[PDB]
Write a protein that binds this ligand. Structure first.
Ligand SMILES: [Cl-]
Ligand SMILES: [Cl-]
Ligand SMILES: [Cl-]
Ligand SMILES: [Cl-]
Ligand SMILES: [Cl-]
Ligand SMILES: [Cl-]
Ligand SMILES: [Cl-]
Ligand SMILES: [Cl-]
Ligand SMILES: [Cl-]
Ligand SMILES: [Cl-]
Ligand SMILES: [Cl-]
Ligand SMILES: [Cl-]
Lengths: 214, 214, 214, 214, 214, 214
């Protein structure tokens, strides 16, 4: 990554490869990806994606999302005809942001220049957008089906609930509705009664400590 | 972390991930977290939290604590209306300290500027506050129940006592009362007699060496 | 690699060696190679190749490809007779780009000089060209033979399809034809009907989510 | 640690944690601790101690020793009343040296300032003092009980002798008396005769090579 | 290694040690050695050799080769009598290049001085010369004995051929003769016929793809 | 180690610890030690020795050798009475070189000052001197007892010979006599005849290749 240019480290690459083998597309893979690609050029971002073996339905799916975002960027940013003056550099296309039609030096130029054109962070947003689509498709369970089993420790039910909740790509408002509606509704009879008694404004801490004995 | 900005290292991230898998929320997890997040920006702190898979009841609980602290910061620090002058940067909100509504560059700006606004260390205190709440809730044993078993080496009883003591979030004054009261009271008959004979001002060293033979 | 010269790191070398032992010549080996050889001089590129034990039919094959590209470079770039002036350095031959007839200092000279002569990136392209030839020869399955089995989850069929597709060295236009023709054609009866109903312009996401239940 | 400030490295922390799990409080733990804490601030020293899980009787014992040394420092160094001038910084208390009542910046200030106030090395001496107390208490064998068994290779007896000797916290004069008295006295009959014949001034090398055959 | 002097890294040393234990004197050991000794002083080169345990017939053999090359250097470079002036440094002998009679500082002096006297790269060539002698002696199979077995995949026969070829220290002209003569001659009947039909100028790629079905 | 001071790295320390556990006092331990202690101050050298657990007969033996060398240094270098002037630093005693009576800063002073007083390299020579004494004492086999067994491959006999030779601390002249006398003398009948026929000036290479078939 990068403001002095640097190659992607052996142990960044290796760490990313192992993450995908072990955890596939579990929600936490996406923060790991972003963490390992901090300050990454499009070339470095493409490296991480291309070094993934297997999971090629998702990697192909990711390409289409990236292409869709590229087409959208080109629509909003039409390229103007003309010779690039000595002090300036050309406007990036969608394919330049995705790294397929731009050199490393062009990518370095845009990121470092005074008006920064952060193609690294733009392309990364496109990748993360497509990764979210994969997680949601690749999640086995639906949030609607998470119901506490009889004699299930609440703590284990809440772990399953917010884990499954974590893989829906839901906005904060949508995730807020699911919490106040499904969590208490789908608790088991013994603890559900207790939770109705806490009222309409109790924290998760209060709900978990309330059903700790039961 | 950071005064030159730096990305979170592959082996910092990986170390933190393994800590939580192996040790869950054992008291020592919190010092490990703080150690691995030294000089961290809110973006780096959020990275560590988001890269944790599982334990999503606690991670959700942690969000509420962070939001409570954010609401408290906003109450004490009301934002004033106006255009941010060239030489200055805006006042951070609670959400800016938690990183959700601020950019990396804004976080870098506050931490490096001459009046330092250490959003990293402020947000970290909020996270550590919530981590303490988790440890205490997630501790299986109570300090009141730690009693030395018949024929139990004192050393093993003291290990269990101060381990269980370690997970209560007790102030120094509260932890002091538990030591002078419960430790000797809940020792086994043979060693308890010996300890009453040491008097009301003996060190742990003297108590452990006194009951070494018995 | 390199603009200050640096030796190839112990853990770059070791990482590359393990990659080839574990994954042989699977498509992802090539992006891994390029990633680990970022900014590499021809000497560093030769190091990575020579440190590979076994697979000597491929490594020998790679030599011929490199020699073919060297012969082509010499044809296009004929060397002129004359003593190299103090301020300049000689024109590289194909063997100079491949590192066999040039010193490390000559390779450093070309890469750093004001008109950059990127022998590292030129030789790397020749190596990657030959690596593609190996992958295609060393691929066991043909893309034509990938047919979805009865009761096979589409997701698994698409994984096999784009994995096998990945090892053909096909241009984008050739890979595009295979997608729109073979993927739907070679699906199993139950899902194939569903896919004909999506129409002639649906994304992979829509095709995978359509055949998710079936 | 530090004269430019630096955070404690991931692999320093991890190394220290593993040392205590594997070797507990074996004499060599103390040199390992000092080695891993070279140039450490009190904050870094507290980190290493707090990240130790288990062994909480010793860690609590260590706190008391540190508090005793703190009380002693305060007695010898009484704090004077007054506002700290711009060019100077306040006098450290015992709690400031132990890091509990001082900030990282105050600790950095004292260590770097022209009259250096090495709170890191002072606090480290207090910690090492308490670690020695633990080793001696936690040693199972006494030096008095190490007697060479019949047919025991001297080399193995000398290994046991100086290992057990190593955990007594004995001054050089006390350890010198034990060598010249117990080592030869407690050897087995066959080798003991040989050693009396070497005389009152022979080296360990001469004693070991003398009893090599026997 | 080195133009600022540096000590050999822990992980360079360890990597080299493991290479020799696992792979002995397989052809690839020599490129690994050269890679790990890039920019090495004679002291660093001697370190790598001396840290090898076992294989002492080869390490002794290597000493003689180094001594032979040293004697040859002294013959070609006779030392002149005189006091070394302040601005200059003495001429290196063979033993100075091998590090046995020169200090680290003398080795640093020669490598860094304006007329560079690369004792590191000279001594390294002597070591690599002797390593080649070992590989050839320590190779179990002869290139003459590599014959394709009945029903042996050509690819496996070519792997064995160029592996065994790799350990002969043969010049390019000698290795060229073996390829065009033995490879086709010693193929099995079914594939041999096919290869005669390709003609006297076909690549390894064409030969391997020709005998792929057979 | 060091001309800017640096703390001993976590992975230097750990590497040294593992070396001694796995290989004890095999000849190669000594080059490993020297390699890992390149540029080490006496404090760093003492760290490596003190972090060794077990083997305390040898570590104690090493202390005596170091003390003997210290006494010898003091005899040759008598300390003169007087106050150390501002521009100068005091003369080191034997105990100052061994680090027991000197501070880290004094050790840094001597090593960096214009007339360098390399206490690191002096003390290291004393340690290496004592390590050689240990290896020789701790070697199980004598060079005199290495005789080639009937049907033993010469290569294996030469490995045993120069391995056992390696642990005698023999000068080059003493090791030279053992080679020309014992190696051929103690070979087995079949190969011994062959070696007498090579003559009185053949290399190890010629001797090993001569007895390769037999
Ligand atoms: Cl993310
Ligand atoms: Cl969520
Ligand atoms: Cl903490
Ligand atoms: Cl506590
Ligand atoms: Cl590639
Ligand atoms: Cl593809
Ligand atoms: Cl110590
Ligand atoms: Cl001792
Ligand atoms: Cl080589
Ligand atoms: Cl070859
Ligand atoms: Cl040595
Ligand atoms: Cl030897």
């Amino acid at each position: 990554p990068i403001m002095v240019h640097q190659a992607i480290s052996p142990r960044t690459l290796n760490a990313w490869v192992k993450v995908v083998e072990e955890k596939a597309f579990s929600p936490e893979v996406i923060p790991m990806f972003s963490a390992l690609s901090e300050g990454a050029t499009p070339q470095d971002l493409n490296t991480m994606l291309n070094t993934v073996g297997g999971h090629q339905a998702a990697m192909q799916m990711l390409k289409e999302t990236i292409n869709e975002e590229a087409a959208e960027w080109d629509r909003l940013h039409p390229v103007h005809a003309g010779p690039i003056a000595p002090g300036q550099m050309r406007e990036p296309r969608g394919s330049d942001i995705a790294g397929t039609t731009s050199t490393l030096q062009e990518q370095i130029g845009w990121m470092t220049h005074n008006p920064p054109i952060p193609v690294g962070e733009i392309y990364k947003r496109w990748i993360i957008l497509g990764l979210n689509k994969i997680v949601r498709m690749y999640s086995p369970t639906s949030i609607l089906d998470i119901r506490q089993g009889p004699k299930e420790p609440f703590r284990d039910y809440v772990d399953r609930f917010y884990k499954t909740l974590r893989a829906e790509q839901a906005s904060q408002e949508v995730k807020n509705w699911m919490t106040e509606t499904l969590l208490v509704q789908n608790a088991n009879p013994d603890c559900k009664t207790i939770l109705k008694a806490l009222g309409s404004g109790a924290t998760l801490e209060e709900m978990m400590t309330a059903c700790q004995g039961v």
